[PDB]
């Protein structure tokens, strides 16, 4: 046999990147996990290189990032890349999760594959949040107050958890310092997890924009997709270059160049964009405990998707009624996001409420309904009697 | 790109890893040459160099 196959190390390399048998028919949507791994690497490199000049003490914190900006050589490039990149991470990840809904990847044998990505997505929100709390601007100190406070929602012990988790009376110094340390830790957990995610992916191989079996027309990832993936890569960097050098804050909130202040919340509380649709869902609920629950449920519900999909085929591709609502879902989700940016004013609150309903109803109601109907259209739409 | 003008240098083989790196090395100076020029010109009058010119103290 060849060496790359024989070696203990290069055999993995080969079997996941060179000799892997992919469906012949998969399109640029599938380039997302590739581009996902690329962000995680951009996050970790630029992060470490920045940490070398960062101080996580509540005083020096806000300034030290300005330090990285004003002083460290290419340091501004370090920051704008870390930050803009986190966003592109989140876009690309949504598009990756989109693709999985639309073509019904979440669907057996790929459940575990799917489920793990739900864990990753959770860890990426956890990660990026902490990285935000580390700037220690305004949005940071108050972001960090609310997330710490989601835990009060926990019966009885809830306040104490928060106190613990704070290391004192308020989001104070023992807080930003642990938020820095936990920001270091976690990305390795994502990477740990990306590995099991890629292991699940591996034992079943990728699906296709046809939701039929691949096993009749496979081709090897090298050199097609290696080269295919290289196209999305450069394109990815281009738009990222565009933001990073020309629009470095066309994606951030100006309230964050203001040093955090524990006595005075601002009056424009727009949180991060990739977070907005959840902010919306959270607000939509006039009850504290329930509101929290429903925010978390907005992500968990993603785990029922392989049961509620009642269909007999994987893929909206040959699915008109499925396509249609699938884009109501996408578009709801964006609206939900617009709702997050606007004030708790009218009719916005009530619009927010309706989208939220539409949201969970799509997994829990529309989908199993539609898909069951769609089975029956597929029967009577041909056969004799 | 013309089949004559290429094949002259490289006959019927690609570029070779080292020739690449060589070009890279050259390109990188030739580029940062051009682009830094076109930019200092495009912003003529505006540069502190152009302003250092008139202004005296």
């Amino acid at each position: 046999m060849a060496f790359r196959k024989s070696n203990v190390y290069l055999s993995l390399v080969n079997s996941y990147i060179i000799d892997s048998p992919q469906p012949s028919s998969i399109n640029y949507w599938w380039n997302m996990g590739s581009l996902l791994g690329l962000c995680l690497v951009i996050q970790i490199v630029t992060g470490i290189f920045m940490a070398m000049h960062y101080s996580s003490n509540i005083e020096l914190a806000f300034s030290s990032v300005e330090h990285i900006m004003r002083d460290v050589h290419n340091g501004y490039i370090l920051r704008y890349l870390h930050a803009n990149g986190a966003s592109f991470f989140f876009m690309v990840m949504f598009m990756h999760m989109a693709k999985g809904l639309y073509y019904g990847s979440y669907r057996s044998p790929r459940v575990t594959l799917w489920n793990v990505g739900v864990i990753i997505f959770i860890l990426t929100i956890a990660t990026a949040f902490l990285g935000y709390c580390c700037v220690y601007g305004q949005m940071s100190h108050w972001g960090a107050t609310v997330i710490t406070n989601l835990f009060s929602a926990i019966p009885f012990v809830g306040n104490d958890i928060v106190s613990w988790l704070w290391g004192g009376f308020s989001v104070s110094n023992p807080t930003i310092q642990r938020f820095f340390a936990l920001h270091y830790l976690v990305p390795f957990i994502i990477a740990a997890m990306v590995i099991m995610h890629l292991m699940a992916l591996h034992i079943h191989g990728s699906s296709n924009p046809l939701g039929i079996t691949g096993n009749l027309d496979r081709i090897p990832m090298h050199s097609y997709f290696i080269f295919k993936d290289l196209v999305t890569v450069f394109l990815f960097m281009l738009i990222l270059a565009l933001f990073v050098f020309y629009s470095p804050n066309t994606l951030g909130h100006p309230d964050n160049y203001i040093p955090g202040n524990p006595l005075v919340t601002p009056a424009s509380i727009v949180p991060e964009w990739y977070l907005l649709p959840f902010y919306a869902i959270l607000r939509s609920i006039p009850d504290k405990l329930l509101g929290v629950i429903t925010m978390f449920a907005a992500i968990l519900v993603l785990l029922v998707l392989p049961f509620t999909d009642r269909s007999v085929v994987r893929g909206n591709t040959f699915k008109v009624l499925s396509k249609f609502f699938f884009f109501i879902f996408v578009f709801n989700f964006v609206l939900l996001g617009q709702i997050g940016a606007c004030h708790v004013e009218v009719p916005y609150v009530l619009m927010g409420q309706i989208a939220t309903f539409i949201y969970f109803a799509y997994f829990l109601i529309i989908v199993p309904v539609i898909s069951t109907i769609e089975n029956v259209l597929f029967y009577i739409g041909r056969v004799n009697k | 790109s013309f089949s004559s003008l290429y094949k002259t240098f490289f006959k019927r083989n690609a570029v070779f890893v080292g020739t690449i790196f060589a070009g890279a090395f050259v390109f990188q100076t030739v580029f940062d040459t051009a682009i830094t020029s076109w930019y200092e010109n495009h912003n003529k009058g505006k540069l502190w160099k152009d302003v250092k010119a008139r202004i005296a103290a």
Binding site: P21, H204, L216, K323, F327, C342, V346 | -
Partner: protein, 93 residues
């Protein structure tokens, strides 16, 4: 190597699929073709077909959503205007 759990994929020569007979494939070296295989000309009559075949499934839902957006948007600018403060004191409490 212990036993592995059965799946629905194998590697080449045991890929997993059914036992092919009858098909006959033909291809030609990537060297042996026009650089720019088929660009512009009739390759673009499809950049409007790959469009047509789907656009409705996006536009229709985008529409529903963008008009619903504009509506309450307008409606909000109103009740927070002079001409609106009336309806406000009512709708809002």
């Amino acid at each position: 190597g212990p036993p592995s759990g059965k799946t629905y994929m194998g590697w080449w020569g045991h890929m997993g699929g059914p036992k092919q007979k009858g098909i006959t494939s033909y291809a030609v070296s990537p060297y042996a073709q026009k650089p720019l295989q088929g660009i512009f000309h009739n390759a673009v009559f499809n950049s409007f077909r790959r469009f047509k075949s789907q656009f409705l499934y996006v536009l229709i839902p985008a529409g529903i959503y963008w008009y619903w957006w504009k509506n309450g948007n307008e409606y909000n600018e109103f009740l927070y205007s002079k001409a609106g403060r009336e309806e406000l004191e009512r709708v809002n409490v």
